[PDB]
C-alpha cells in the first residue's frame, strides 16, 4: 500500500532550449493504478516561453500506468527508493531535446526534478515559431537491458494537417537494487498526452493516460 | 472484385548487403481483407545467405491489412494501378538497409519487385554473424503528407534475451492519380511478422498479420 | 604500370529517388596520382531528372587521390582486382541516399557500376525542387576496421546563402586479399566536387580533386 | 582591447551521464590569437568519474582560434557580452552527450559555465568502461544561419587500434546583438584536443589548438 488510489505530484523543471533559460513548477494528481493523471504547470522564469511547450510536455510520470496481463511494473516496484529517467528526443526537422528526471516519494506526494537541454531547433520550424497543436497518442516499446528498462517511441506533433515526427531514446534506472525487482520482458505502453489548457506561454494543464500491454495481434503456430 | 478474399503473391528481390549480392523469389498467398498472408522464399543467387534473412523479411505486403473503424485503405484503393513503397531501416549498431518496392496486380496475383541495399552492418554484429531470432510484433505510425502515405516504426530484432532496435522511415506512393484516392488520417498498423521455417540460409517461410486502427486509449474533453 | 598517369573512366548508374527510375552513363579521365579527374554524365533514362543531380554527383572515383606523407593507398593497392564502396547519405531535412558501387580495371579503363536508392526526400525541399547549387569542399575521415576502410563525412549542399547538411557513412571493401594490402591508419581526404556545366537535367560535367593527408596542426608533447 | 595574447580561463561544469551526477572546475590560460590554450580540470563532486573524461573534454573554448584568410571571428567580435554554445553529440554505439555553455569575460578571465546531460551510453561500451585513449584531430564545418553560427563535426575516440565515431551538432549564439557582428561565411576549424595528463579519474590537463581556414584545395575555373 505504498502508493494510493489518489496521489499528489510536485514537479520542478529547469532548462535551456536554443539559448532561452526557463524554470517551471507543476502540481498534479492521478490514480497510478488506473494510469490517469493531470498537472498544472507554471513557467516561473523565462516567461513567456518562445517555443511550443509541447516539447516540454513529455518531460512532465511513469508511476501512472495501468498494467495489464500481469506485466511486472518496474516503476511501482521501485518505491520507496524511486527511479530516474533520461531521454533524448530527436526531431526530424533538427531539434534535439535531452532531459534527466528524478522521481521520489514523500508520503502521498511524488516529487519530480527535471533538467532539459534543447539544441539546434530550426528558427523557422514549428517548435520555435510555437505553431504546434499537441501530440498524437503513441506507443512506447519497453524492454530490459541488464536491469535498465529501455524505451523507444515514435511521436507525432500536430502542425495543422501535417505531423512532425520525433524519436524517443529513454533509459529508466531504479534507485532500488536490481536484484530486488522483477524485470518485465518486452512490452508496450500506450500513452495519450493531452494539453487541456494554455495561457500566454506561461501556464499549461496536461492530462495523460497510459496502459502497459502485449500486442493484441495473435501469434500463429 | 479486383481483390479476392484469396490472393496469390509472386515476389522477385535483388540486392547487396555488405557487398554480398543475392537474388530471391517468393511465392505467397493471403486474405487481404482479413490482413493475413504467408510466403515461401528461395535465395536463387548468393545462397547460403551470409547474413540474417531477418533483415529482408519486412521487404517481402501492405495490401494485406485488416482495416477497422472505416479507416480509408491507401493500398487497396490504389488498384488496378497499384503502389510503390520505399524504406530506410537504421539499426542502432550501425547497419542501414534501403529498399524500393513495386506492387502490381495481374488477375489475382500480386507481383512484388524489390531492390535492397544494405550498408555498414558491423562484421561482428548479429545480422552479419546471422544470430537473430526473428522480430517482435510492432506498430507502424501512418500519416499523410500531400498524396504520399508515410510510415515510421520501431522494430526489435531478437538476439537471445537482448533486443537490437531499428527505425523504419517509409514512403508509400499510389500509381493512381491523387484526385481518385481518399487519404486516411493518422493511424496505426499492428504488424506481427513470424518466420515459421528456415533451411540452409536458402529457404524461408514467413507469416504476417496486420491491423489498421486508432489508439485503444479514450480521449478526454 | 597497372595504373597510368592518364586513365579513362566509364560509369553505369541505375537507380530510383522518391519513385523516379533513371539510368546515367559517364565518360571520364584523370590522373590518379595528381588526384584530379573529370566526368561527362548523360541521363540515358528518366530524363529530365525531377531532382537535383547534386545528390548523384558523389556517386560518380576514389582511385583518384593525391596521397601525401607516405599514406598507404587502399584504393591503388586494390588493383587489379579493384574494390567496392557502399555509402548511405542522410540529409538533415529527411532525404536518405543509399548507393553500392563496383570499380574494376581493364587496361587503362576504370569501369564504375553504381546502384542508387533515394528515399523520403521532402517534396518541398531543395533536392526535389532542384534548387541546390553544388557542394562545398569537404574533408572525409578514413580509418581501418579489420580489412575494411571506413569513411565518415559532413557535406554541405549550397542553397543560395543557406547550407543543407548531410552525413556520409561509407565502407570501402577490397576485392584483393586483405594480407596483400598495407592498410593505412586514421587520416583525412580533402575532396572538392565541382559541377562545371548542366543542361536540361539530362547532361552534366564534373571535376574533382582529392588529397589524402594528416592534420596540418602540430601535435604537442 | 578586452582580448590580449595571454588570457586566463575559469570553468564550472555540472552534469549527469547515465545517472552519474558530477561537477568539475577548470583553470586555464591561452593565446586566443595563436589558437592555443591549456586547462587543468578537477572533478569536485562524484569523483572518481565512472566513465571516460574524454566525452567531457570537448565541453571544456571557441575564443581560442587563430583566424587565417581574414575570416571574421564570431567569437572575438562577441565580447564583452560573450556567446553561448549548445551541442548534441551522437556516438555510433548509442551514447548521446547534450551540453549548453555560457562564455563571459571578467577582466582578463574568461568564465565558462557548462551543463552536461549524457543518456543511453552502453554499459559494455568503452565510454562507461573508461577505455578510450583520447581524440584524433578534427575539422569542424562552420556556417551562418541568420545570426547563429552552426557547427557540424565527425570525431574519432581512440579505442586501441579501433575508432569510435561521434557526430557534433553545435549552434553558437552571440549575446551581442546579431546586427553588430560581421558573420563569417562557410569555413572550417581545425581542432586538436590532447589530454596531456590524467590522475585518479579526478584530475586532467587538456591542451588545444584551433585554426579557422578555407579548404587547402584549389577551385578550378
Q: What is the DSSP string of chain B?
A: --S-SSEEEEEEEEEEETTEEEEEEEEEEEETTTTEEEEEEEEEESPSPSS-GGGTGGG--TT--EEPTT---TTGGGTTT-EEEEEEEEETTS-EEEEEEEEEEETTEEEEEEEEEEE---TTSTTTTT----BPPEEEEEEEETTEEEEEEEEEEEETTEEEEEEEEEEEEESS-GGG-----SEEEEEEEEEEEEETTTEEEEEEEEEEE--SSPPP-
Q: Which of A8, A13, A92 is nearest to A49 (CA)?
A: A13
Q: Which three cell numbers stand for residue D20?
A: 552519474
Compute CA C95 distance to the chain's CA centroid, rounded to the nearest angstrom.
17
- Judge contact between C206 and C194, C-beta under 8 A: yes
Compute CA D74 distance to the chain's CA centroid, rounded to the nearest angstrom.
15
Question: Using what technique was this structure determined?
Answer: X-ray
The C-side interface with B (CB below 8 A) comprises: 16, 18-19, 84, 86-88, 94, 96, 98-100, 115, 117-120, 123, 145-146, 148, 150, 169-171, 173
As a whole number of angstroms, the distance between CA A189 and CA A153 comes to 9
Q: Which three cell numbers stand for residue D29?
A: 590560460
Q: Taking CB atoms and an 8 Å cutoff, what residues of chain A touch B143?
A: 156, 163
The C-alpha angle D210, D211, D212, rounded to 5 degrees, equals 125
Evaluate the omega torsion of the peptide bond into residue C48 and state whether it is cis, within 30 degrees of 0.
Answer: yes
Which CB contacts under 8 angstroms, 24+ apart, belong to B26-30? B26/B60, B26/B112, B28/B60, B28/B61, B30/B6, B30/B61, B30/B64
As a whole number of angstroms, the distance between CA D128 and CA A173 comes to 15
Up-side HSE of residue C204: CA atoms within 13 Å toward CB?
27
Please write down the HEC assignment for all residues of C116-152.
EEEECCCCCCCCCCCCCCCECCEEEEEEEECCEEEEE
Which chain B residue shows the shortest CA-CA distance from C83? B19
- Judge contact between B51 and B127, C-beta under 8 A: yes
**Cβ neighbours of C166 (radius 10 Å):** 22
What are the boundaries of each domain within chain B? Answer: 1-221
Maximum CA extent, chain A = 58
**Beta bridge partners of residue B97, listed in sequence order:** B89, B118
Q: Which residue has the cell 574533382?
A: C208
Q: C33: distance to nearest CA of chain D, Å?
A: 15
Q: Which three cell numbers stand for residue C74?
A: 587502399
Which chain B residue shows the shortest CA-CA distance from C89? B96
As a whole number of angstroms, the distance between CA B119 and CA B127 comes to 12
Q: Which residue has the cell 513495386?
A: B102
The C-alpha angle A138, A141, A142, rounded to 5 degrees, equals 130
- Judge contact between D120 and A85, C-beta under 8 A: no
Q: Resolution of the coordinates in A?
A: 2.3
**What does chain C come to in residues?**
221
Q: A24: distance to nearest CA of chain B, Å?
A: 25
- Judge contact between A206 and A38, C-beta under 8 A: yes
- Judge contact between A64 and A36, C-beta under 8 A: yes
Exposed, middle or buried: residue B204 (CB in 10 Å: 0-12, 13-18, 19+)?
A: buried
Residue D43's contacts (CB-CB under 8 Å, 6 or more residues apart) are D22, D23, D24, D49, D201, D202, D203
The C-alpha angle B21, B26, B30, rounded to 5 degrees, equals 145
As a whole number of angstroms, the distance between CA D112 and CA D107 comes to 14
As a whole number of angstroms, the distance between CA D176 and CA C205 comes to 44
Contact between D154 and C152 using a beta-carbon 8 Å cutoff: yes
Task: Label the pairing between strands D203-213 and D66-67.
Answer: parallel
Encode burial over B56-77: b for 16+ CB neighbours within 10 A, e otherwise.
bbbbbbbbbbbbeeebebbbbb
Residue D1's contacts (CB-CB under 8 Å, 6 or more residues apart) are none
As a whole number of angstroms, the distance between CA A167 and CA B169 comes to 11
Contact between B94 and D94 using a beta-carbon 8 Å cutoff: no
Q: Which three cell numbers stand for residue C205?
A: 560535367
Q: Which residue has the cell 547534450?
A: D98
Q: Which three cell numbers stand for residue A43?
A: 513557467
As a whole number of angstroms, the distance between CA C150 and CA C213 comes to 16
Q: Which of B172, B168, B170 is nearest to B148 (CA)?
A: B172
Contact between A94 and C92 using a beta-carbon 8 Å cutoff: yes
Task: Label the pairing between strands D7-17 and D20-31.
Answer: antiparallel
**Per-residue CA distances from D171 to A92, C41, C165, D45 (Å):** 17, 38, 14, 28
Q: Taking CB atoms and an 8 Å cutoff, what residues of chain A touch C92?
A: 94
- Judge contact between A137 and B187, C-beta under 8 A: no
Residue A91's contacts (CB-CB under 8 Å, 6 or more residues apart) are A97, A121, A125, A127, A157, A164, A165, A166
Contact between D19 and A173 using a beta-carbon 8 Å cutoff: yes
As a whole number of angstroms, the distance between CA A163 and CA B150 comes to 10
Amino acid at each position: 500500500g505504498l502508493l494510493k488510489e489518489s496521489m499528489r505530484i510536485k514537479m520542478y523543471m529547469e532548462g535551456t532550449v536554443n539559448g532561452h533559460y526557463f524554470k517551471c513548477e507543476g502540481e498534479g494528481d492521478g490514480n497510478p493504478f488506473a494510469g490517469t493523471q493531470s498537472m498544472r504547470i507554471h513557467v516561473t522564469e523565462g516567461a513567456p516561453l518562445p517555443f511550443a511547450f509541447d516539447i516540454l510536455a513529455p518531460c512532465c510520470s511513469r508511476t501512472f500506468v495501468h498494467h495489464t496481463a500481469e506485466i511486472p511494473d518496474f516503476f511501482k516496484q521501485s518505491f520507496p527508493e524511486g527511479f530516474t529517467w533520461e531521454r533524448t528526443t530527436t526531431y526530424e526537422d533538427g531539434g534535439i531535446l535531452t532531459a534527466h528526471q528524478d522521481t521520489s516519494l514523500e508520503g502521498n506526494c511524488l516529487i519530480y526534478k527535471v533538467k532539459v537541454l534543447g539544441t539546434n531547433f530550426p528558427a523557422d520550424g514549428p517548435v520555435m515559431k510555437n505553431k504546434s497543436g499537441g501530440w498524437e497518442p503513441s506507443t512506447e516499446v519497453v524492454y530490459p537491458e541488464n536491469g535498465v528498462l529501455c524505451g523507444r517511441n515514435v511521436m507525432a506533433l500536430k502542425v495543422g494537417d501535417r505531423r512532425l515526427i520525433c524519436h524517443h531514446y529513454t533509459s529508466y534506472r531504479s534507485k532500488k537494487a536490481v536484484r530486488a525487482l522483477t524485470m518485465p520482458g518486452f512490452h508496450f505502453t500506450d500513452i495519450r498526452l493531452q494539453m487541456l489548457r494554455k495561457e500566454k506561454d506561461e501556464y499549461f494543464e496536461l492530462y495523460e493516460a497510459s496502459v502497459a500491454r502485449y500486442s493484441d495481434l495473435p501469434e500463429k503456430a
